[PDB]
Ligand binder design. Structure first.
Ligand SMILES: CONS(=O)(=O)c1ccccc1
Lengths: 263, 1719
């Protein structure tokens, strides 16, 4: 029993430093991107995701806090059943390991007016055999508020951090999934009514034959995970044609750079 | 030499640096003695006696100095002792000197004398100094010394008008400070890093004198920098055989004789050694060596010692106490004063009642500093580098006024202020060395300087210096201070780094160069004299007496180290060294070689800030830094908070370094003394280390890391993170308001859309809303926009417009602001293009246009980005997305015309023996292309296009059409255009032979002179012209029948329509088409071209049907071309050229070991350097003279005809060179030697690539950029030049192939592959050059309204290309209404400009008419802006010399990219000429001729390549003059017109109005003029009216020379004049005044003007000018060309009846002296 023989002093070892070190290694995974093809029958639309924007999306992300982008695209001139993803849009957001928080307002920019919305992509820490109930709820609420999101055409792509790699899987809602998700108020992991038949897998392919681009906010950056207080479901934003900054870029965590200045 | 050994350099290093003590014993002056005390020993050394003025060495009075140098001793009566002994050597000779004397003895005044000698070398006869002829470098070891020397030298020399200055650490903008300064004062390191960088016409060629102050720094760890400077200077000297004087100033220490050898000082002439008895004040020395080892007891022992010494001087002498930490000054002064209070001795310093107390008491109340507060009233003071300036001046003025009694200070005082003291105490000799990471002894230079402050030169009879140190160091300090510590070399450590710097410069290219270089090192001299000291046995030395082998071993070792670290590629067998880009960066940024190896190993495009900080922290500059236990808690506190995470533990040094940098950027205060000094060291290094990293990753194209590292450079410089308000960078803005702005998170960008009011309200501080608004709009900001101009489907041209969008203010922007333009790919990952952009103050409100090329591909990528980012301001960037969604790409180009495999065509196919005789001796068969096109050319009248590579024999294709013309029409006229005058001359020779000699037709070459060119056109069957000479003629085609009655129009090199002078070629071709459509007897057109991808558009524009369009691609060249494009990854030009030197030789031996070779190089200088370097390489191949194929004796008669000796040597070894600076005779001789196979290699400057008459088997193009001195930037070779160079690799009669190696910067390689292996796309640029042509067409009534102007445009190549490649011309579609709108817009713009300029009128906004001013511009072929300027400046009383100034300022004159150093020569020309010129500005391309005209006129001088320059200027002068005449004549003025006419005469004969007419006669001079004045003859007619014998006697001239005089006299104009006033009585007021003048020559001469100093051949022009000088009024004027007899009318109105007496003038434009006057 040492009140005095053995005294020790606590020394902060803060969480985000370790995660910043980890996020600096994300580029290694962009060489090991897998798409699951466990779906069958080939009936719905086929989605083609250009590798350049997917690699960038991975590189700007975090191992533990999900990030999301909005998907915009069109069909090739003569194959209406193929959807080419041409743009990812990053909007102000924050996330946990289980969900992302986006504004209510969807991207508006003239430069996107010739594309159709195709849904959204998000990262998550681990693979999962099923589409999470949070994703179903989020997608269903977006669709309920935005009739431009066609339930037969908008998808969720999940980007799961597997060993030294990323695994992509794409899903869409079913009618019953829309109806359950739009009324679901239980944010937990096992909300009542949630069913495996609330979604289904959809065919997705990676491509090197064309390039997508990004749009990002016009006056902020997209990452608010260090300033959630400044983030609001009702916030509004404009967009610009530019590429997104990585998760731990200085413009995302300016309080680390003003507070260190006090020793 | 083969058996080399690898040495351990670290085992040869003297680890103690300047503390190394080579002497084993120290002898002390007589009367020294050693006292013992508890725990320490004292040694006392008495003051010395001065040597008693032996040798009757009188003090030299300033009177007996040379008069130019006395001014430098204004306010002195005599010299002092040392300068009197040094006067003759310093002031009366140029001998290199070494002066050893005790510090303070006067050495700097001797350096002053050397500077005066140099300045004397540059006296004008007006007494001024040509301050631009020379630089002097004064190297001083310490920065504070640099500053004090700038001040005192500047004051001593200001009377000379000379500028002394130091150099800023910023040099990428402030290198104009070198240009402005005559005396540069800097540290060794600064001059080393500046001269490591080899540039273009830098000022190191002006260096005549280098002074190395405190040269005993050789013994310091810094000493190798001096060795590098001296070895570099001496080797440069011998390289260039221009002498440079070296002066060394040294303390008196052993080995001075070896220092003198090192400086090339002749010991009998330039070595002077004054021992310590020459100290200005004798010095009693006390050394105190403490034996105590326990730190605690040792420190109190030291404080008791200093108190006892203080007590010995209290109230009798001031004491200066030197300590080694700014904090120690206060702590020590406090220890002393506390001991004085406790011992009650403070009264001895500050006496009560004395006036000194009374003086101190004032600022003893005031007290600006805190420690100064606690200490100043007691009589104590501190002084150091954390204090203010006026605090330091307070201390200085108080001490010097004998008021302060005890001043504690640091070394900075000793170096930077001239403050001596009776007693000096050095309190300890230990100092903390961050770079060594530990405590060491003070350096010797510091110790010498501090003790040199002991004793004040007039007050004290002696000084007393007291040094307190540890006992074991006594013998060192005793040795240092009594002339016995020997000066050694520290170079072995630094050898790899120093060797790399010389490899990077090209001074050392192999191991033997390196042995030679090491032979000039101080190390080598010391190795020779004390071998065992340097690790060499005495028997090693006897077996190797010049240490050739040992130097080889050292060089081998260092080179292997450099090669292991990838700075150099070292070939062990040949000893050769290949430079690399990473080696260049190491040298130019002063980085050690291990560091750049670490960077090369760890830098990756994917690095984040975390790893970038870690990389920086591993630099080897920090390898001695450790983490001390006592530092670990504070460091941990900083680590757990740093904003950039650190991965490694605080056990490792790299984490401490990282954290220290980050703490510096955040401006944290640290507590540990070691941590603070370590931070200083780390961050002083960080700026240049991080700029090196930046240059590396930028040139690799790594977009994200380029951004992060440029940002980190800026955060280190500004000491803040990105996140902070960029307004912090305005130091004047008070921090509080910026903190308030930061607290609010809103974007800084929002501030732009606010005003004073809203700005005051947003931060809730209205009082500042105005000044904030000011600073917001001083923040640098640029608006961007692009014009995308597709070249092909895979290459895009971008024109970026940069518009400044901020208010300039010199107080925050200086004189320039630098930016990086980065063009980045879709992902912002690769930098596709980048460049430096400098916004100068003078252009701060102007838009700037930048053009560059990027690659593109299909399917088009979404977008690129253009970022323009400040090089210095944080968060100062604009990024423009460049979307391609609406890019219209041109159609993929069609396949070529297939080369059919036909029977080669015998010459007999001409079916004409006379025709066949032109070729049947040359060859038996025509080549495949000639064979394919022959039927169409020779047997049809169809318009023909032949596209094919240079060297395909297209000229013969045109000859076929000419021969058809000759069979159709006995007097056929073929006009033949080529774009380059040198080509025109060659074609003139060849075709004069073929068509005049063997065919008896008339071949003529247009000259540029209208009437004679009209005569040539009339009589010629073949008329050869460049484009402008045909433009001016064919403008007047409605009145020139010989222009319409052209049978054949051939245009050669028509692909140049797409280049710089393409518009005029397009215009004349379009005109010939329009004429042919208007005269219904069509003009056959044949167009010849390099292979064109869009040939069908040229053909269609020129009326060539597709079966008559031969569009061949490069692989059809009849002599196959083997083209190799070799990329060189070095971004610095001189270094890249260095890396090319050996590949040039290897390309010769691989591709053309026996057959002739042309090497094209970027500049005149490089031609000689590359010839020499090739010779050097083949000598080291033991293959010297392999390029010489005739025998030397067969070559000597040639060699004598040359003035260039170097050219004679190289030619003797089989290598020639050609550059613009060679007399035409020399050039012809070299070309003859080359073509006759006598010499195998010729090196030619790029600018000759169009006028060479040689061809080779192999062409090497060594680099593809050249330096434009006008804009001070490198410019890429036009693709047209490169194609023409490649074309020289072509010998159809002799080679089975041609070979060409292009060596280019790596980032150019893809471009050349696209535009040499494939046919070339060309565009029009007529839309940028429309005004003069519109104006001409309005004058000749081809354009009479705006509809005519659109119709006119439809005949152009511009018009066709607008539908093929609309975005190139800024159309957004090809619809006919798009076309019509675009053309209308262009037409309205052009006609509006011409109307504003008063060249044309516009009525009812539709109809255009020419104004007389437009008619003049068109008639004389002068740019409309020039003639507008003429219409402005001219008046009724402009002076002649003003005319010269006007004419020099004209769009016509932009021709000089060579000389800025002759600006001073022109400054003195201004005095030599009687031109009272106004506005003495200087250095413009137009300002040359402002007086370079007069340089021609007076016959003043013939000088250099400027000769060629003058010949172009004079070419345009007459027209310009005549325009002025015309202007004046139209206004009505009588006098200034005649002035202009006589100036025409002046330019022709090169004389002036007041000068003598006799200056016109050949073989005359001034003595003949005064003799003819003595006889009384002043006219040419006078000389004609003399007897032949008396004529021959008066002139004192040769027979043939008076025959020259006679020919001039028999073409001199002697014209009989007569006039008649038609109906002279019947003249009514209001009617006509028809005056008639008949003129008759006396012998109807038929030669042109005799005008040897005027280039072109001139016909004689005359003006019949009737006016009245009564009021400067001209009433009628007519120009005339007189042949034998001419009858001239003149019309005039008679206003009112009255006095009617008028003056008739007859004025020549050519001769001076025939100007008549009749009534
Ligand atoms: C250090 O060498 N560089 S320099 O001082 O500018 C020099 C130029 C020419 C001759 C001698 C020295």
């Amino acid at each position: 029993g040492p009140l005095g023989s053995m005294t020790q002093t606590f020394s902060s070892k803060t969480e985000w430093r370790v995660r910043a070190i980890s996020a600096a290694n994300l580029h290694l995974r962009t060489n090991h991107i897998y798409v699951s093809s466990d779906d069958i029958k080939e009936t719905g639309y086929t989605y083609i995701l250009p590798k350049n924007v997917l690699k960038k999306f991975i590189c700007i992300s975090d191992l533990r806090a999900q990030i999301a982008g909005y998907l915009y695209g069109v069909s090739p001139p003569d194959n209406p059943q193929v959807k080419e993803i041409r743009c990812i849009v990053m909007v102000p957001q924050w996330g946990t390991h289980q969900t992302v928080h986006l504004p209510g307002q969807l991207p508006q920019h003239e430069y996107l007016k010739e594309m159709e919305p195709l849904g959204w992509i998000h990262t998550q820490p681990n693979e999962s055999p099923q589409l999470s109930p949070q994703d179903v709820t989020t997608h269903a609420k977006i669709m309920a508020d935005n009739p431009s999101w066609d339930g037969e055409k908008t998808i969720i792509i999940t980007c799961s951090f597997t060993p030294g790699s990323c695994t992509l899987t794409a899903y869409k809602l079913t009618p019953s999934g829309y109806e359950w998700g739009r009324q679901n108020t239980d944010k937990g992991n096992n909300p009542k009514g949630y069913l495996p038949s609330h979604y289904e897998r959809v065919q997705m392919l990676l491509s090197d034959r064309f390039l997508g681009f990004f749009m990002v906010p016009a006056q902020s950056s997209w990452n608010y995970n260090f300033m959630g207080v400044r983030h609001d479901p009702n916030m509004k934003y404009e967009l610009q044609l530019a590429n997104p900054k990585e998760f731990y870029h200085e413009v995302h965590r300016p309080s680390h750079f003003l507070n260190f200045a006090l020793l | 030499l083969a058996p080399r050994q690898v040495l351990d350099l670290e085992d040869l290093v003297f680890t103690q640096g300047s503390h190394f003590m080579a002497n084993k014993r120290c002898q002390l002056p007589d009367g020294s003695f050693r006292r013992q005390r508890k725990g320490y020993e004292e040694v006392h050394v008495p003051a010395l006696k001065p040597k008693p003025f032996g040798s009757e060495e009188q003090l030299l009075p300033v009177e007996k100095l040379p008069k130019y140098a006395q001014a430098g001793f204004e306010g002195f009566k005599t010299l002092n002792r040392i300068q009197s002994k040094l006067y003759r050597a310093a002031l009366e000779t140029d001998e290199n000197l070494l002066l050893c004397a005790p510090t303070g003895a006067g050495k700097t005044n001797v350096a002053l004398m050397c500077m005066l000698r140099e300045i004397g070398k540059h006296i004008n006869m007006d007494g001024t100094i040509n301050v631009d002829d020379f630089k002097i470098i004064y190297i001083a070891p310490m920065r504070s010394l640099v500053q004090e020397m700038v001040g005192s030298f500047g004051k001593r020399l200001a009377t000379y008008g000379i500028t002394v200055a130091e150099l800023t650490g910023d040099h990428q903008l402030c290198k104009e400070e070198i240009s402005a300064t005559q005396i540069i004062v800097c540290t060794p390191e600064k001059w080393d890093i500046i001269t490591r960088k080899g540039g273009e016409r830098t000022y190191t060629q002006l260096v005549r004198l280098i002074i190395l102050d405190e040269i005993h720094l050789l013994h310091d760890d810094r000493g190798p920098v001096l060795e590098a400077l001296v070895a570099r200077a001496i080797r440069n000297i011998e390289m260039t055989q221009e002498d440079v004087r070296l002066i060394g100033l040294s303390a008196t220490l052993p080995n001075y004789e070896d220092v003198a050898t090192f400086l090339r000082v002749d010991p009998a002439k330039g070595l002077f050694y004054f021992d310590n008895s020459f100290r200005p004040v004798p010095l009693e020395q006390t050394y105190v060596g403490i034996t105590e080892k326990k730190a605690i007891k040792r420190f109190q022992i030291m404080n008791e010692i200093v108190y006892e010494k203080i007590m010995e001087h209290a109230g009798k002498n001031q004491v200066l106490v030197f300590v080694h930490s700014r904090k120690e000054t206060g702590k020590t002064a406090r220890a002393i004063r506390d001991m004085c209070l406790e011992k009650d001795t403070l009264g001895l310093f500050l006496r009560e009642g004395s006036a000194s107390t009374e003086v101190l008491r004032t600022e003893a109340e005031q007290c600006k500093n805190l420690e100064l507060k606690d200490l100043l009233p007691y009589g104590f003071a501190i002084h150091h580098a954390g204090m203010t300036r006026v605090d330091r001046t307070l201390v200085e003025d108080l001490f010097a006024d004998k008021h302060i009694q005890v001043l504690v200070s640091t070394a900075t005082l000793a170096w930077g202020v001239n403050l001596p003291a009776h007693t000096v105490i050095i309190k300890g000799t230990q100092v903390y060395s961050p770079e060594k990471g530990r405590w060491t002894e003070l350096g010797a230079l510091d110790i010498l300087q501090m003790l040199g402050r002991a004793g004040r030169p007039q007050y004290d009879t002696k000084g007393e210096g007291i040094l307190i140190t540890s006992h074991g160091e006594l013998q060192y300090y005793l040795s240092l201070l009594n002339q016995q510590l020997p000066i050694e070399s520290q170079m072995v450590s630094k050898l790899p780094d120093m060797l790399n710097a010389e490899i990077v410069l090209g001074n050392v290219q192999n191991a033997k160069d390196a042995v030679n270089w090491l032979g000039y090192a101080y190390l080598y001299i010391r190795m020779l004299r004390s071998p065992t000291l340097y690790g060499i046995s005495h028997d090693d030395l006897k077996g190797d007496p010049l240490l050739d082998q040992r130097r080889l071993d050292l060089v081998h070792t260092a080179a292997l180290m450099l090669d292991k670290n990838n700075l150099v590629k070292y070939d062990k067998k040949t000893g050769n060294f290949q430079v690399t880009e990473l080696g260049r960066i190491a040298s130019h940024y002063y980085i050690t070689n291990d560091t750049v190896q670490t960077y090369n190993q760890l830098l990756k495009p994917t690095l984040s800030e975390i790893e970038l900080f870690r990389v920086f922290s591993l630099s080897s500059e920090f390898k001695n830094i450790t983490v001390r236990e006592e530092e670990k808690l504070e460091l941990q506190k900083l680590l757990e908070r740093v904003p950039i995470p650190v991965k490694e533990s605080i056990e490792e040094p790299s984490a401490k370094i990282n954290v220290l940098l980050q703490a510096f950027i955040s401006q944290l205060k640290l507590e540990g003394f070691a941590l603070m000094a370590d931070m200083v060291y780390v961050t002083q290094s960080a700026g240049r280390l991080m700029r090196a990293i930046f240059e590396i990753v930028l040139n690799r194209g790594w977009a994200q890391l380029t951004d992060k590292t440029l940002n980190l450079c800026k955060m280190i410089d500004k000491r803040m993170w990105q996140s902070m308000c960029p307004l912090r960078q305005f130091r004047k803005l008070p921090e509080e308001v910026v903190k308030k702005i930061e607290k609010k998170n809103f974007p800084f960008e929002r501030l732009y859309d606010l005003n004073h009011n809203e700005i005051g309200e947003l931060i809730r501080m209205p009082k500042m809303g105005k000044t904030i608004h000011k600073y917001v709009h001083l923040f640098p900001k640029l608006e961007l926009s692009v014009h995308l101009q597709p070249i092909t489907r895979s290459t895009l041209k971008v024109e970026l417009t940069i518009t400044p969008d901020f208010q300039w203010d010199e107080k925050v922007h200086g004189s320039s602001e630098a930016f990086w333009i980065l063009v980045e790919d879709v992902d912002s990952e690769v930098i596709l293009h980048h460049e430096y952009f400098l916004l100068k103050a003078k252009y701060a409100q102007d838009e700037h246009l930048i053009t560059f090329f990027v690659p593109v591909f299909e399917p088009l990528p979404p977008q690129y980005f253009i970022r323009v980012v400040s090089d210095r301001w944080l968060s100062c960037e604009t990024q423009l997305p460049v979307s391609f969604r609406h890019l219209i790409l041109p159609e993929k180009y069609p396949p070529p015309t297939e080369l059919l495999d036909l029977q080669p065509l015998p010459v007999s196919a001409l079916r004409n023996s006379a025709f066949e005789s032109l070729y049947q001796d040359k060859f038996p068969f025509f080549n495949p292309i000639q064979t394919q096109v022959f039927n169409t050319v020779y047997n049809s009248d169809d318009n023909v296009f032949v596209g094919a590579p240079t060297g395909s024999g297209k000229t013969i294709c045109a000859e076929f059409a000419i021969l058809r013309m000759l069979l159709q029409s006995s007097e056929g006229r073929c006009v033949y255009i080529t774009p380059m005058e040198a080509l025109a001359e060659q074609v003139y020779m060849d075709w004069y032979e073929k068509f005049q000699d063997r065919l008896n037709k008339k071949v003529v070459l247009l000259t540029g002179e209208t009437s004679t060119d009209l005569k040539l056109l009339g009589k010629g069957n073949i008329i050869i012209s460049t484009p402008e000479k045909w433009d001016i003629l064919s403008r007047r085609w409605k009145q020139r029948k010989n222009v319409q009655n052209i049978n054949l129009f051939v245009v050669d090199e028509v692909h140049l329509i797409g280049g710089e002078n393409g518009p005029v070629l397009e215009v004349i071709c379009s005109r010939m088409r329009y004429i042919s459509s208007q005269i219904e007897r069509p003009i056959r057109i044949v167009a010849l071209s390099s292979s064109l991808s869009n040939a069908k558009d040229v053909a269609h524009w020129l009326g060539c049907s597709a079966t008559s369009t031969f569009n061949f691609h490069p692989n059809v060249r009849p002599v196959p071309l083997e083209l190799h494009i070799q990329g060189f990854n070095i971004s610095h030009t001189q270094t890249r050229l260095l890396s090319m030197a050996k590949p040039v030789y290897h390309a010769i031996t691989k591709h053309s070991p026996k057959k002739p070779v042309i090497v094209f190089v970027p500049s005149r200088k490089q031609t000689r350097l590359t010839a020499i370097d090739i010779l050097t390489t083949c000598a080291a191949d033991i293959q010297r003279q392999r390029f010489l194929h005739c025998t030397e004796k067969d070559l000597i008669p040639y060699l004598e005809k040359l003035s260039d000796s170097t050219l004679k040597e190289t030619l003797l070894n089989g290598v020639g060179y050609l550059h613009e600076g060679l007399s035409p005779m020399e050039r012809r001789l070299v070309e003859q030697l080359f073509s006759s196979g006598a010499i195998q290699v010729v090196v030619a400057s790029r600018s000759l690539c169009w006028g060479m008459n040689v061809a080779a088997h192999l062409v090497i193009i060594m680099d593809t950029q050249y330096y434009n001195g006008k804009i001070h930037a490198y410019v890429d070779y036009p693709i047209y030049d490169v194609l023409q160079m490649v074309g020289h690799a072509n010998r159809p009669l002799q080679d089975d192939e041609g070979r060409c190696v292009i060596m280019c910067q790596g980032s150019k390689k893809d471009f050349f592959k696209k535009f040499l292996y494939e046919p070339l796309p060309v565009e029009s640029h007529l839309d940028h050059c429309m005004h003069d042509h519109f104006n001409a067409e309005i004058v000749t009534k081809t354009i009479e309204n705006k509809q005519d102007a659109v119709d006119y445009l439809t005949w152009t190549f511009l018009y066709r290309r607008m539908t093929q490649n609309p975005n190139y011309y800024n159309l957004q579609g090809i619809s006919h209404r798009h076309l019509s709108d675009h053309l209308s817009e262009l037409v309205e713009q052009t006609l509006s400009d011409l109307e504003q300029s008063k060249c044309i009128s516009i009525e009812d906004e539709m109809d255009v008419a020419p104004l007389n001013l437009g008619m003049i511009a068109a008639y004389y072929y002068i740019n409309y802006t020039t003639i507008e300027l003429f219409s402005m400046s001219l008046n009724a009383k402009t002076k002649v010399r003003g005319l010269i100034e006007i004419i020099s300022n004209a769009a016509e004159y932009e021709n000089i990219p060579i000389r800025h150093h002759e600006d001073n020569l022109l400054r003195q020309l201004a005095q030599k000429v009687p031109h009272k010129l106004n506005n003495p500005k200087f250095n413009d391309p137009h300002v040359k001729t402002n007086l370079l005209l007069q340089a021609h006129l007076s016959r003043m001088q013939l000088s250099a390549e400027l000769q060629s320059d003058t010949e172009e200027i004079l070419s345009k002068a007459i027209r310009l003059i005549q325009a002025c005449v015309d202007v004046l004549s139209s206004n009505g003025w009588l006098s200034p017109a005649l002035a202009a006419m006589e100036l025409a005469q002046m330019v022709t004969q090169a004389m002036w109005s007041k000068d003598s007419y006799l200056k016109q006669l050949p073989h005359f001079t001034s003595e003949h003029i005064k003799r003819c004045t003595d006889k009384g003859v002043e006219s040419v007619f006078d000389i004609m009216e003399m007897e032949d014998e008396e004529r021959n006697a008066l002139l004192q001239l040769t027979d043939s020379q008076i025959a020259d005089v006679a020919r001039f006299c028999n073409r001199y104009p002697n014209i009989e004049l007569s006039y008649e006033v038609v109906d002279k009585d019947s003249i009514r007021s209001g009617g006509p005044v028809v005056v008639l003048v008949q003129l008759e020559r006396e012998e109807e001469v038929t030669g042109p003007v005799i005008a040897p100093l005027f280039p072109q051949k001139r016909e004689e022009g005359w003006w019949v000018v009737i006016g009245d000088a009564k009021s400067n009024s001209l009433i009628s004027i007519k120009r005339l060309t007189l042949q034998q007899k001419a009858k001239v009318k003149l019309d005039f109105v008679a206003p009112a009846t009255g006095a009617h007496n008028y003056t008739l003038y007859f004025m020549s434009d050519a001769y001076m002296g025939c100007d008549q006057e009749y009534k």
